Structures are given as C-alpha cells and as structure tokens.
Amino acid sequence: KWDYDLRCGEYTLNLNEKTLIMGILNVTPDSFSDGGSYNEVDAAVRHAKEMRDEGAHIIDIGGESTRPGFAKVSVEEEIKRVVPMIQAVSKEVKLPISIDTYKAEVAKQAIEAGAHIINDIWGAKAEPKIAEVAAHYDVPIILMHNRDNMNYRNLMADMIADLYDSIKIAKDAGVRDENIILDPGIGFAKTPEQNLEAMRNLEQLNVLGYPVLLGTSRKSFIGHVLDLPVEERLEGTGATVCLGIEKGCEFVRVHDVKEMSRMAKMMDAMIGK
C-alpha cells in the first residue's frame, strides 16, 4: 500500500507492517517554576519510558498552549517548558518524538531540541509559518482537521475540503507529500453526533492519498455515548481505535498505551496488516 517509509531522522517508521501507536505525554507543570525542573522533567521521562515499554512507537509531547488545557501562554514561556522535556526524553527514550503545537516558533525550537515530527491541531491554519518550519527541517507534519465553528453543510465533504486547504498551505511552503499526515480532528469543532458520523465515514479520508492518524483517546463524545467519566473510557476508546484501524488508519494517538497497543496488534492480525 505505502511505497515509502516515514523518515524521522535517526528513526524510520514503516507504514505497512502495523498500526503505529503514538503515546500522549502532557506536561505536568511545576508551580514555582517556568520549566526545566527535576520533578517536572523526570515525571515526563518516566512516563515516556513506561509508554515505550508498553508498545508506543512515538512519544507526543505537549506544553500548556495545546490540548487539553488551552492556556493563554506566550511562546517565550512555552519554550522554557517544552524544550527541557524534549532534550531529556530524546536523550533517554529511543523513540521518535512529535511536538504537539500549532505555533511556528515552538515547533522550530522543539525540533532544534530533538523533536522529529510536528503535530498541529490547526492544520497549519493558525500559523502558516509552521509549514515553512516543517519544510525547512524536512520533518513529518500532522495536519489535523479543525475550525472555529460547527456550521457544516455536509460534514465529511467539508472535512475533506478543510483538510485539503491544509495540504495546499503545506505544499505551497515546500512540504513533500511524504511528510504529510492527516488527522480527522475528532473531538474538535464537532458536535457529539458529528464525531460519531466522522468515525462512521473515516475511510473517506483515504482518497486524499495520505497516511491518517486517529486521535479519539478518552474524548468527550465517548462519554456522551456511554455516560461515563474520563477515567472509565478505555472500552469506548478501544472501540474507536478498532473501527479506525478497520477503516485504514496508520496511527492512533492514545493515553492508555498498554491496552490500545494490544487491541491494535489484534486488529492488525485480523485485517491482514
């Protein structure tokens, strides 16, 4: 299916042998410091090691500007927090690292500090220069579907249009097809019912011809269906991962690495991946 591998500097990810598991690392910020402290970075490192041990192929690192928190915090402050995490994790965990930011300057620093992949929840629409950063360092970029409203004429057709606008921003800036990954942005700019509909029709994203990353871990729409709180969302996350893999997804972005990684492996055997 994929006649290339994803090139991540020192690491290389094969897109055909198995669904790739991206493990979610959120910063736990120390109060009393703007970042780089022992408790903070060691908590990040320890968690990356656990996820590596549990089958994660990628460690995804987010500062405070990004999901789930969305704090109004400067690029100056975000760098003092996010860079020390990347330096330590990249040194101590032999796995590619993605930086979960929409900010061009943060992406740049994160890669200088050792990050291999860019993960943008705004699909290069919040800060287009991020695509230029991506183009220059020659790294993979994940363009997630998002927008500032839920006014859809035809959900899927609009998602594909919206995504394609991100592909065009990325390609105009010099990003090669091989460094583009798409993400349907489940849990963003969608009603619960639209989240379900997006999941039901995920296979449509495949006609754009790029690898697809699915990120449904623990999200709210699972709670809406099961009437269950965030810490009891394992089975529902599971379902979404399984359905995603059946519908052709190459990556899933998850908090519960042990469990989701086992489900992914079993799905792969069944569908013949």
Ligand X SMILES: FC(F)(F)c1ccc(/C=N/Cc2ccc(C(F)(F)F)cc2)cc1
Active-site residue numbers?
219, 253
Name which of 20 and 267 has its Cβ closer to a second copy.
Answer: 267
Q: Summarize as ranges the residues that interact with ligand X (CB under 6 A).
A: 234-235, 238, 259
If one asks whether residue 215 binds a second copy (CB under 8 A), the answer comes out as no
CA 26 – CA 117 distance, rounded (Å): 16
């800060």: which residue's tokens?
A: 127
Strands (E), the chain: 6-8, 11-13, 20-26, 58-62, 97-100, 117-120, 141-144, 180-183, 213-214, 251-254
Contact flags string 175-204 toward a second copy, x per CB under 8 A: ---------------------x--xx----
């529902």: which residue's tokens?
A: 236
Strand 11-13 with 6-8, pairing: antiparallel
CB 82 within 8 A of CB 71: no
If one asks whether residue 161 binds a second copy (CB under 8 A), the answer comes out as no
Q: From the list a second copy, ligand X, none, pick the one residue 26 interacts with, judged by a Cβ distance below 5 to 8 Å according to partner type.
A: none
Name which of 170 and 199 has its Cβ closer to a second copy.
Answer: 199
Task: Tell me which stretch binds a second copy (CB under 8 A): 84-92, 153-161, 207-215, 225-233.
Answer: 225-233
Task: Tell me which stretch binds a second copy (CB under 8 A): 40-48, 72-80, 127-135, 260-268.
Answer: 260-268
Residue type, 191: T
Name which of 211 and 238 has its Cβ closer to ligand X.
Answer: 238
Question: Which residues, 6 or more positions from 246, have their beta carbon under 8 angstroms from its beta carbon?
Answer: 267, 271
Which residues would be at the binding site for a second copy (CB under 8 A)? Answer: 196, 199-200, 222, 225-226, 228, 235-236, 238-240, 242-243, 246, 259-260, 262-263, 265-267, 269-272
